[PDB]
Amino acid sequence: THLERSRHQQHPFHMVMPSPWPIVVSFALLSLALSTALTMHGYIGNMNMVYLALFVLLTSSILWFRDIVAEATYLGDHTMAVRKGINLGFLMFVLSEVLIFAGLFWAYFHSAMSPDVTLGACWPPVGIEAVQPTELPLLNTIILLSSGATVTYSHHALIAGNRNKALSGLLITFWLIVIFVTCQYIEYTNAAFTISDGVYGSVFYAGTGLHFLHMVMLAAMLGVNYWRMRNYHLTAGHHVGYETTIIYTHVLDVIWLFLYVVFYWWGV
Amino acid sequence: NKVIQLQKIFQSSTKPLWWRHPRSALYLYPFYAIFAVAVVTPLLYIPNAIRGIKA
Amino acid sequence: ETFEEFTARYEKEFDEAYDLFEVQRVLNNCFSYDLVPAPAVIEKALRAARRVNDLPTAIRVFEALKYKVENEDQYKAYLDELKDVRQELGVPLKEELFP
Amino acid sequence: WLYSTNAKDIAVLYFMLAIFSGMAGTAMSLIIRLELAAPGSQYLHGNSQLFNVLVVGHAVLMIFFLVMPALIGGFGNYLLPLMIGATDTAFPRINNIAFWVLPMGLVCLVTSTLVESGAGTGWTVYPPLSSIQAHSGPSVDLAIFALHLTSISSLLGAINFIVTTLNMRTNGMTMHKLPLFVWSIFITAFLLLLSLPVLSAGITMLLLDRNFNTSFFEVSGGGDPILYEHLFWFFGHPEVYILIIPGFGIISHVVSTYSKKPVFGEISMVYAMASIGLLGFLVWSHHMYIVGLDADTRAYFTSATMIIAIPTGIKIFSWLATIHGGSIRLATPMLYAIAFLFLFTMGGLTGVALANASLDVAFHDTYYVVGHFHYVLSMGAIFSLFAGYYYWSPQILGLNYNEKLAQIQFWLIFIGANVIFFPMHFLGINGMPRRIPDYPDAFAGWNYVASIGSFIATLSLFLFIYILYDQLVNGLNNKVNNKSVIYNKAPDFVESNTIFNLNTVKSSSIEFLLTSPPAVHSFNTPAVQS
Amino acid sequence: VHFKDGVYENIPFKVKGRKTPYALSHFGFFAIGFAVPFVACYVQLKKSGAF
Amino acid sequence: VVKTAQNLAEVNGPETLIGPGAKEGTVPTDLDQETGLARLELLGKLEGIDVFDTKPLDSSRKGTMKDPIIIESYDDYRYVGCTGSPAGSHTIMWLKPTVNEVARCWECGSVYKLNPV
Amino acid sequence: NALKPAFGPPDKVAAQKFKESLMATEKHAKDTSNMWVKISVWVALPAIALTAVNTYFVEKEHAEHREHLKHVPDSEWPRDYEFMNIRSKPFFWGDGDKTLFWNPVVNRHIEHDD
Ligand code: HEA
Ligand code: HEA
Ligand SMILES: CCCCCCCCCCC(=O)OC[C@H](COP(=O)(O)OC[C@H](O)COP(=O)(O)OC[C@@H](COC(=O)CC)OC(=O)CCC)OC(=O)CCCCCCCC
Ligand SMILES: [Cu+2]
Ligand SMILES: [Zn+2]
């Protein structure tokens, strides 16, 4: 027939209504960047406008995300190509966020590959004492190798159809990551060298610093992957809000292993 | 559980999609209160930041 | 490809012209090549204009022939060669018309 | 309307800002060149500050607020939906934040001058010059954030173009058959993705060394300022190969439209166009030959950045091959695209003279560099932006632009900006340094020659505003009289006039088969190709 | 703009039917963009002693 | 009264494209808690006929004016390409066969009609 | 009637390749997911069961090590180098705070003007 075909869309790609959260996030990125440069130089007195700028930005993301899940499970222009659009739009995105590490790995090969004169002739220098890889940093590698063996233990389990392994298998992975925040909170509270400890104090809390600033959003990504799977939002044949979480962690084994070999093993 | 229930409400709603949640009336007027202040007070201190008057 | 395969291909396509459009779109690419077309194929470029009852697309043949002849000496010997089939159809040239 | 997510109406907001930032980016260059008219500070009274503020205030409006949002935003958000066969972009909601952070990238920059200090750091914002002991106020704090808002708009503005080209084509549009303007930006989108996160660490580390005193770059602590010279310039040379690859897309469409002929070697033009993008990564310290690199490291780069002149010779000799046989219809996009083929290539010969490590040691930071990079920025990326506006203005706006008045705007740009940038090669071959408000008295010769020309080019730009006024008010009364040119392709020699109005547009792209202006839904059915 | 693909209705301007002449609102967008460095050359000279 | 479709044949409006609710204890099994137009593409993918076309136009024969090439249009102005009778033999040229006028393809010589449906 | 015959031909050849493979991938969602249960909860969780207690005991010898330095230095600090402590443009949320959270067991920073 053709009368219903003249009442529907004829191309698989999605058409979105005009949303105003585009200019809401833009106004937050102004009041983030403008206000974080004022309190460094006065003019306000208190450091809470940046705390305001981290609040209006992040609630603007979930209101952006509330309209997206209204399109994901409640309006649904997600065809095969549009499913391949985001799944390649995010797989090509993490090529950018793995290259920003090469903007921080290459500083570590700038102060240790050729020895400098302001420091000692050894890396790490005198006065600065590093943690051996046969200590609590080795717990940080095995707890992700166990994370890399439970994110795929629950990847196929959601497609498998049973909810005893699909629901409970993501709560044990979520608390495996909040416990990873606290063991990278030990070296932020018990290690000798600080952020202002010269060039070894600079890049060590940058290469491992940005690896800590991604778990705050990864655990926040599990914070909706358990809420949606309990509120029956995600499905077992079409899951984008669950697939972007696995590739957020399956590449994380590769970058942390490259982070562990030069910061700790080659870094002593 | 509410996925078919909300699908009756979201589809054929004749509303803006950011007003199409049933739990969305309280989500906006406090949000428009923190939006009406965070875009003027970083900018109202700019004539205070031109004369050297800092804090 | 060669000069002769050029002649046999475009003297064939002029026969199934059937319209004013498929004369001018085929007279175009019979003149928009690197080489110069033979008088064998241009005789079917005037018979194609007679089959469609349009005279200025037969006066525009001899003006496209004038610019793309590369020598006036190789044009008057080329003009007198076509005078056998240019006096039957009564096709003038643009300089004799003086428009 | 303000927050409509249609990709057509976003790209008209992109172009509405790239002239506002243009008439601010060239009013600063007016005062810059007015101060170099005579020795002694004439108009600036005695202030050598507000001259390293205006130079950075001008050089970043031209790069990041004119040529970036027009050749990628102003056109790529209008043509890559249209030529490929999409209805709009693949991610249309983030398509609106990629524009609306750009005025917020302006309030983060115009207020960076109005504050008490003024960021006198230059465009290459170097670490010990911009350190907190040197620059104290919040001036350079905002100048390293407006460079971050544009770094993040044009980053997600290129994720929007890899998952548009790779899946959202039509039926017969195979991967070997695309318009060259799409292969410009899709190749560019694999350089915008792989160079901007390098930059975003190279600026945030300078933020950390200014109010968090972490000493990535501070000398007291072993932090080099020479790490910045290879980490910013790792972004820097791909950045100037991003202002020219969409410039290589528009010229490949104009020069093969106003010549009634397909482009010479189209498959040869797409392989020598990613090879510019790929090999442009491997040459990033030719800017820093004198900074104390090794005698074999400079020996590699003096052989490696000459190989960028291998595929650019293919992409020029084929533009001298695609107009050899064919006709030439000298309208205004053909005038720009044929003076682009002479003034960009003279900005290429000065490229390979600067490319040597054995010859940059008598040319760095002189005015011979500014003579070289302005033949490939105001003559290679404005000559392809004027040849892209005039080529798609009445097709997109619907109104013709008084063609007899756009020819005098071409010549006042051609000879009224060659008079500025040609004597710069003479002041630099003697050794006049850059960014200076005053100079030795022997450099007052050509600096008055190059000062008479900046009123010529910026009188043509005042005329270009009037062309924009004649196009919007009585731009409908242009194609009904003999003011403009209507049909950009005149018919053939044996094509009769009464048969031309049946088969009018013999284009090779969808962009002209659409209506003028195109519809709000110009694709509501999947089109087919071959 | 969502609908009405007319002639002047893909631009957020108001070209025809304006109460005031359009050359006020067209040169007044491009000369204002020209006069922003001439107020950066004003409040930074008057602050720094010059005039 | 407004039931579901559960087959490619019946549509009869947009309110009949939803699926039925699934009980607690099991996941949605790709056919129950679906959405609509994603389910509409899936219901066509459930059968042996694609809802959308990824196939070029019939570029085998040339197409005269007495025997033209018919395209399966769905509106007035379906744009077509013309890359040859072997589909690779000449430069592309884009066309627009409108309502009861033909696109004539000056270079190749192919004639297209609309078939507006 | 006019102009509304049918959409297209229901050939049923494009079916039974995507539908039966959804059960074949379901098998690949079954036995491969059961391949990881013998190595996640049976290998990796006993691997951290011998590693966490290996680090539960070496944590306590360092938790007592910090109590020595925060108690007394017994002369003074060993006068740290010029790169270890830098205070150009001191911090803005407080007066001289090193970071968001820092204990004085490792971050004492006593000035030695002398
Ligand atoms: C996009 C790049 C771009 C462009 C177009 C220009 C254009 C111009 N620039 Fe600039 N310039 C730079 C980028 C650019 N410049 C950079 C990076 C520096 C170095 C800073 C640093 O490193 O210190 C620099 C530095 C620089 C100097 C200082 C030299 C030194 O210290 O290094 C001078 C002074 O003569 C100068 C002048 C000019 C002039 C007269 C123009 C004229 O071409 C402008 C007048 C001409 C026009 C009329 C055309 C442009 C106007 C438009 C609005 C565009 C049209 C487009 C649309 C409207 C569709 N420039
Ligand atoms: C925006 C466009 C652009 C483009 C396309 C180029 C292209 C090139 N640039 Fe340039 N360049 C800049 C913009 C650009 N540059 C800028 C903004 C700066 C820095 C200024 C600053 O720091 O402020 C700069 C700086 C810069 C330097 C640093 C000098 C210094 O600061 O000390 C050098 C030196 O190596 C250089 C070289 C080249 C070369 C070799 C090319 C080559 O790609 C060009 C090759 C092209 C051809 C040669 C012509 C066509 C080819 C032929 C006809 C055939 C082959 C040729 C022959 C066989 C001879 N550029
Ligand atoms: C911030 C924004 C500021 C913008 C300010 C920019 C100002 C630029 C203005 C340019 C302009 O408006 O010119 C277009 C206008 C209309 O032209 P048209 O395209 O309709 O075709 C006309 C017909 O085809 C031929 O016109 P004709 O040949 O019959 O007239 C002769 C004309 C030619 O001489 C000149 O152009 C220079 C003087 O001479 C005169 O008219 C002298 C009269 C005193 O042509 C004219 O009549 C121009 C008259 C002179 C205007 C002052 C010039 C100052 C340099
Ligand atoms: Cu370069
Ligand atoms: Zn054809």
What is the SS3 assignment for D37-83? CCCCCCCCCCCCCCCCCHHHHHHHHHHHHHHHHHHHHHCHHHHHHHH
**Is the CB of D509 within 6 Å of ligand 1?**
no
Torsional class of G103: left (φ above 0), alpha (ψ -120 to 50), beta (otherwise): beta
**Is the CB of D352 within 6 Å of ligand 2?**
yes
Distance from CA of A163 to the nearest CA of B (A): 14
Decide: residue D435, CB within 10 A, 0-12 exposed, 13-18 middle, 19+ buried: middle
Asked if A170 and A226 touch (Cβ cutoff 8 Å), the reply is: yes
How far, in Å, CA of B52 to CA of D291, rounded? 39
> Residue F56: which of A244, D530, D457, D183 has the closest Cα?
D530
**Tokens 């309280």 identify what position?**
B26
Decide: residue D66, CB within 10 A, 0-12 exposed, 13-18 middle, 19+ buried: buried
> Residue D194: which of D229, D155, D160, D166 has the closest Cα?
D155
Measured torsion, CA atoms of residues A250, A251, A255, A256, in degrees rounded to the nearest 10: -20
Distance from CA of G76 to the nearest CA of A (A): 16
How far, in Å, CA of A24 to CA of A43, rounded? 25
How far, in Å, CA of G103 to CA of C41, rounded? 97
- In F20-105, DSSP assigns E strands to 69-70
Domain of residue E35, residue span: 1-51
> Residue D186: which of D270, D311, D102 has the closest Cα?
D270
To test ligand 3's pocket by mutation, which of E22, E27, E32 has the most ligand atoms within 8 angstroms of CB? E27
Q: Is F112 helix (H, G, I), strand (E, B) or coil?
A: strand
Residues of F with a Cβ under 8 Å from any C Cβ are: 64-65, 104, 106-107, 109
Q: Are residues A61 and A130 in the same domain?
A: no
Q: Tell whether B5 lies on the interface with A, counting CB pairs under 8 A.
A: no
Q: Is C77 helix (H, G, I), strand (E, B) or coil?
A: helix
Q: Is F70 helix (H, G, I), strand (E, B) or coil?
A: strand
**The token pair that represents G103 in the structure block:** 């204990």
**The token pair that represents D50 in the structure block:** 């507000």
The DSSP bridge partners found for residue D433 are D366
| Cα dihedral across residues G3, G4, G5, G11: positive or negative | positive
To test ligand 2's pocket by mutation, which of D56, D372, D377 has the most ligand atoms within 8 angstroms of CB? D372
* Domain end among A77, A99, A119: A77
How far, in Å, CA of D65 to CA of D67, rounded? 6
Look up D58 and say whether it is catalytic.
yes
> Residue D519: which of A228, F115, E18, E5 has the closest Cα?
E5
Q: Tell whether G88 lies on the interface with D, counting CB pairs under 8 A.
A: yes
Asked if D347 and D372 touch (Cβ cutoff 8 Å), the reply is: yes
Q: Which of F92, F96, F102 to mutate to test the interface with D (most CBs of D within 10 A)?
A: F92
Neighbours of C70 (CB within 10 A): 8
The DSSP bridge partners found for residue D293 are none
Question: DSSP for D430-442?
Answer: HTPBSS-S---GG
Asked if F17 and F36 touch (Cβ cutoff 8 Å), the reply is: yes
Q: Are residues A61 and A92 in the same domain?
A: no
C-alpha atoms less than 13 angstroms from C-alpha of C7 in its C-beta half-sphere: 11
Nearest-atom index, ligand 2, CA of D352 = 40
* H/E stretch holding C94: helix C94-97
Q: Are residues F31 and F8 in the same domain?
A: yes
- One-letter amino acid at C27 equals L
Asked if E5 and D19 touch (Cβ cutoff 8 Å), the reply is: no
Domain of residue A228, residue span: 78-268
For the stretch D269-274, contacts whose Cβ atoms lie closer than 8 Å and that sit 24 or more positions apart, written own/partner, are D269/D180, D269/D314, D269/D315, D269/D318, D270/D180, D270/D183, D272/D311, D272/D312, D272/D314, D272/D315, D273/D180, D273/D183, D273/D184, D273/D187, D273/D245, D273/D248, D273/D311, D273/D315, D274/D187, D274/D190
How far, in Å, CA of A200 to CA of A267, rounded? 10
Question: DSSP for G74-103?
Answer: SS------TTT---SS--SSSSS--SSS--
Domain of residue G48, residue span: 1-114
- Compute, in angstroms, the gap from residue D70 CA to the centroid of ligand 2: 22
Asked if E43 and E51 touch (Cβ cutoff 8 Å), the reply is: no
Q: What are phi and psi of D20, to 5 degrees?
A: -65, -45
CA D439 vs CA C56, D107, D364: distances in Å: 70, 33, 17
How far, in Å, CA of D294 to CA of D296, rounded? 5
Decide: residue D68, CB within 10 A, 0-12 exposed, 13-18 middle, 19+ buried: buried
Nearest-atom index, ligand 1, CA of D436 = 31
Q: Are residues A117 and A236 in the same domain?
A: yes
Asked if B42 and A34 touch (Cβ cutoff 8 Å), the reply is: yes
Q: What are phi and psi of F95, to 5 degrees?
A: -130, 175
- One-letter amino acid at D484 equals S
Q: Which residues contact D201 (CB under 8 A, 6 or more apart)?
A: A100, A103, A104, D231
Q: Please calculate the CA angle A106-A107-A112 and round it to the nearest 5 degrees.
A: 100
Q: Is D366 helix (H, G, I), strand (E, B) or coil?
A: strand
For the domain covering D7-502, report its CATH number.
1.20.210.10
How far, in Å, CA of F84 to CA of A43, rounded? 70
CA D482 vs CA A257, C14, D401, D404: distances in Å: 71, 38, 12, 10
> Residue C1: which of C34, C45, C40 has the closest Cα?
C34
**The token pair that represents C18 in the structure block:** 């059937």
Q: How many domains does chain A have?
A: 2
Nearest-atom index, ligand 2, CA of D289 = 32
> Residue A215: which of A144, A131, A135, A146 has the closest Cα?
A144
Look up D287 and say whether it is catalytic.
yes
Q: Are residues F48 and F4 in the same domain?
A: yes
Decide: residue C73, CB within 10 A, 0-12 exposed, 13-18 middle, 19+ buried: exposed
- In F1-117, DSSP assigns E strands to 69-70, 112-113
State the DSSP code for F69: E
The DSSP bridge partners found for residue F26 are A162
**Tokens 């101060």 identify what position?**
D35
Q: Is B43 helix (H, G, I), strand (E, B) or coil?
A: helix
Q: Are residues A71 and A202 in the same domain?
A: no
Distance from CA of A24 to the nearest CA of F (A): 28
> Residue D104: which of A43, A31, E34 has the closest Cα?
A31
* Domain end among A77, A100, A117: A77
Q: Exactly one of D169, D210, D253, D286 is catalytic; name it.
A: D286
Look up D286 and say whether it is catalytic.
yes
How far, in Å, CA of D422 to CA of B19, rounded? 60
Neighbours of E32 (CB within 10 A): 12
**Is the CB of D463 within 6 Å of ligand 3?**
yes
CB pairs under 8 A between A and F: 69
Contact partners for chain C, using 3 or more CB pairs closer than 8 A, are D, F
Q: How many domains does chain F have?
A: 2
CA A38 vs CA A31, A44, A51, G46: distances in Å: 10, 7, 13, 51
For chain G, where are the alpha helices, taking DSSP H only? 19-28, 37-39, 45-49, 52-63, 66-71
Radius of gyration over every alpha carbon of chain G, rounded to an integer in angstroms: 33
How far, in Å, CA of D254 to CA of C45, rounded? 33
Taking chain C, what is the end-to-end CA distance rounded to the nearest angstrom? Answer: 38
How far, in Å, CA of A69 to CA of A58, rounded? 16
Q: Tell me, yes or no, whether chains F and E touch by having 3 or more C-beta pairs under 8 A.
A: no
Look up D515 and say whether it is catalytic.
no
**The token pair that represents E26 in the structure block:** 């067209």
Asked if D425 and D350 touch (Cβ cutoff 8 Å), the reply is: yes
Asked if A24 and D99 touch (Cβ cutoff 8 Å), the reply is: no
**The token pair that represents F79 in the structure block:** 């744009």
